[PDB]
Amino acid sequence: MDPNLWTVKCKIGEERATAISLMRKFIAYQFTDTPLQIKSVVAPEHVKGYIYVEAYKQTHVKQAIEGVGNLRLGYWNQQMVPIKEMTDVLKVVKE
């Protein structure tokens, strides 16, 4: 099976920093009884104001982003990326 992608509102211009912070958080909790259950975070080059979080359940996203200041306006609601649009998240175009 395959997880879904969820959008999470993020302080504008802090998307890359926040994705990296969540990487550290995941590693920090990996040998605890409260591990992060998310699978990845994507911060595409030109996206502003949100990040994408990969997880099987929305609740896993909420649990991972709790306490993360840059994501506070994305804590109560995350929107699922429609399955047909999941590769557009990872699309890069060069003119």
Binding site: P3, S40, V42, P44, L90, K94
Partner: protein, 118 residues
């Protein structure tokens, strides 16, 4: 599975490995080599090799936590690599001499440039 040392230490002078797409600062590639490729690339302790094997031109990042249980890692062809931060697309090409050496050792080189060009 993941090591804190792998994570970019800051946002300045980030580079992406041309072989695996891992993103770290230049000083971290110098200090520790590439977490995935260094047995083959051997850039640890050699800034010149870092400049040859990594690129400052990349697009997007992915904090890859569970490469073994991710759709993203499959699309990006990083599912066999270590947890870490990876570029969505990397601009550049490994030098011909390194590609030839990789091939002689049983490592294929497929471009990490995923960009749709025009």
């Amino acid at each position: 599975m993941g090591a804190l040392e792998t994570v970019p230490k800051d946002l300045r002078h980030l580079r992406a490995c041309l072989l695996c797409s891992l993103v770290k600062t230049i000083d971290q590639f110098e200090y520790d080599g590439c977490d995935n490729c260094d047995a083959y690339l051997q850039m640890k302790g050699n800034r010149e090799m870092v400049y040859d094997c990594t690129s400052s031109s990349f697009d997007g990042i992915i904090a890859m936590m569970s490469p073994e249980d991710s759709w993203v890692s499959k699309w990006q062809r990083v599912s066999n690599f270590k947890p870490g931060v990876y570029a969505v697309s990397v601009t550049g090409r490994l030098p011909q001499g390194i590609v030839r050496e990789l091939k002689s050792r049983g490592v294929a080189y497929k471009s990490r440039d995923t960009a749709i060009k025009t």
